[PDB]
Amino acid sequence: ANLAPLPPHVPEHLVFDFDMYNPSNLSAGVQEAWAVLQESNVPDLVWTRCNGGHWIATRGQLIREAYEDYRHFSSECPFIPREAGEAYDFIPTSMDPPEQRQFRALANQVVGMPVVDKLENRIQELACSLIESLRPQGQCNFTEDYAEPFPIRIFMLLAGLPEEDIPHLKYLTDQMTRPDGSMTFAEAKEALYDYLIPIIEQRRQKPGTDAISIVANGQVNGRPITSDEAKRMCGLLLVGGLDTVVNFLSFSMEFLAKSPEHRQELIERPERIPAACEELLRRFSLVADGRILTSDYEFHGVQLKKGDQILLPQMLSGLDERENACPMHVDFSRQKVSHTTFGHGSHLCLGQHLARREIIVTLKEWLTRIPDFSIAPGAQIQHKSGIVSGVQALPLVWDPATTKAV
Numbered sequence: 187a188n189l190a191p192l193p194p195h196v197p198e199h200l201v202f203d204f205d206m207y208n209p210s211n212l213s214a215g216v217q218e219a220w221a222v223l224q225e226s227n228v229p230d231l232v233w234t235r236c237n238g239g240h241w242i243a244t245r246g247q248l249i250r251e252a253y254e255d256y257r258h259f260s261s262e263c264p265f266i267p268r269e270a271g272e273a274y275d276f277i278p279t280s281m282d283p284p285e286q287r288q289f290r291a292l293a294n295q296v297v298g299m300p301v302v303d304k305l306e307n308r309i310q311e312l313a314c315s316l317i318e319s320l321r322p323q324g325q326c327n328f329t330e331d332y333a334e335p336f337p338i339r340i341f342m343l344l345a346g347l348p349e350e351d352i353p354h355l356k357y358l359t360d361q362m363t364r365p366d367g368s369m370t371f372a373e374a375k376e377a378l379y380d381y382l383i384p385i386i387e388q389r390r391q392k393p394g395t396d397a398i399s400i401v402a403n404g405q406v407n408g409r410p411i412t413s414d415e416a417k418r419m420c421g422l423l424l425v426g427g428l429d430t431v432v433n434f435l436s437f438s439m440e441f442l443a444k445s446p447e448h449r450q451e452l453i454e455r456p457e458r459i460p461a462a463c464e465e466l467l468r469r470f471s472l473v474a475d476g477r478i479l480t481s482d483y484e485f486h487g488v489q490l491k492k493g494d495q496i497l498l499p500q501m502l503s504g505l506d507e508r509e510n511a512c513p514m515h516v517d518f519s520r521q522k523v524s525h526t527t528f529g530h531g532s533h534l535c536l537g538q539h540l541a542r543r544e545i546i547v548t549l550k551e552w553l554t555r556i557p558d559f560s561i562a563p564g565a566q567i568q569h570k571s572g573i574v575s576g577v578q579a580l581p582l583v584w585d586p587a588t589t590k591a592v
């Protein structure tokens with residue numbers, strides 16, 4: 187890899203060239219690959235020369251800490267590389283309190299608990315339809331057959347966007363989280379905003395009841411939201427809607443496809459599913475963004491310099507043995523599932539209730555109809571890493587004679 191020149195103020199012993207877009211031991215799994223940052227030979231706060239050079243807090247306590255101190259760690263540049271953090275202007279994430287506060291309130295109206303509760307029937311229906319549709323096939327490509335359509339259509343439904351725009355939209359968000367080099371972030375950004383601008387003006391003239399209409403005609407600071415702000419808020423919703431649960435579902439199903447005992451457990455004790463959901467969210471956490479130093483600052487003995495970027499992997503907190511014993515083992519009965527999978531501080535994920543709902547429904551509905559399944563033989567499952575990690579393909583197979591329509 188191409189390392190960037192070690193800045194003068196960075197100690198050589200703090201260097202650890204970890205590449206968040208292509209971790210060295212990715213073949214062992216993306217979480218495993220990131221967990222190497224937590225080995226004994228790695229300091230708690232290191233500096234990677236990769237992707238332009240930036241710090242990485244490797245421990246749950248430091249990640250939580252930095253996330254709570256927005257005064258030193260600004261959300262103004264939350265992505266690595268720097269070009270990505272700059273071209274990034276999403277709302278409410280590119281804002282630090284108290285500003286993001288109002289915008290966070292409005293985004294909550296469109297994805298908050300009340301919306302989720304109201305959409306629960308639709309969510310349940312879709313899961314049941316998708317699964318009953320596959321149950322007899324005796325096989326499927328989970329990533330394209332379920333993980334993608336289930337959450338995305340629910341989001342398209344909630345946003346009032348045609349399911350026909352999904353391919354184009356999904357490619358653009360994936361470009362922002364796991365860049366393939368085809369275009370810069372600013373370009374993926376633009377392409378995404380190009381799609382929204384007309385829609386926003388449209389729903390501004392003729393407001394509807396969809397999320398985009400609600401956002402576009404919402405109010406912030408006691409006054410109306412601008413088209414720009416509406417667009418920046420919606421760009422983020424698109425990413426959360428098309429590139430989060432979509433990826434997380436595959437990590438969990440890959441796992442269940444190999445854990446017959448874990449499946450049996452939720453089959454018999456469905457009351458355990460919400461706990462299983464939280465534990466899988468810990469073990470298969472997948473997000474990693476960060477902050478930018480607002481000024482020179484000494485953190486846990488390390489001298490941080492104004493302008494310095496620091497990755498605070500939400501993914502690492504719950505994997506930290508200091509936070510959970512035997513962090514790599516999945517135990518649905520963990521007395522306390524500690525994690526920051528949905529973030530920490532003033533930017534706690536607003537779509538986590540929807541995510542949990544979607545996850546719990548999948549677990550229940552899938553295991554009901556298709557209790558016994560496994561990964562297709564010879565299949566090699568591969569992961570991908572970035573601001574949000576995912577799974578390349580997930581071929582599953584099963585005996586329809588063991589399934590059952592409900």
Ligand code: HEM
Pocket residue numbers: 264277278279286290293297422423424425426427430431434472473475476500526527528529530532533534535536537538540541
């Ligand atoms: C498994 C699913 C998901 C995970 C793991 C996840 C994770 C995250 C994380 C870690 C943050 C904080 C980032 C930071 O502090 O810089 C965040 C913020 C946010 N997420 Fe999610 N998210 C998920 C699903 C969703 C969904 C489905 C939506 C729906 C559009 C969504 C909407 C948001 C919003 C609006 C914010 C901004 C909150 C703020 O800045 O105050 N997320 N998400």
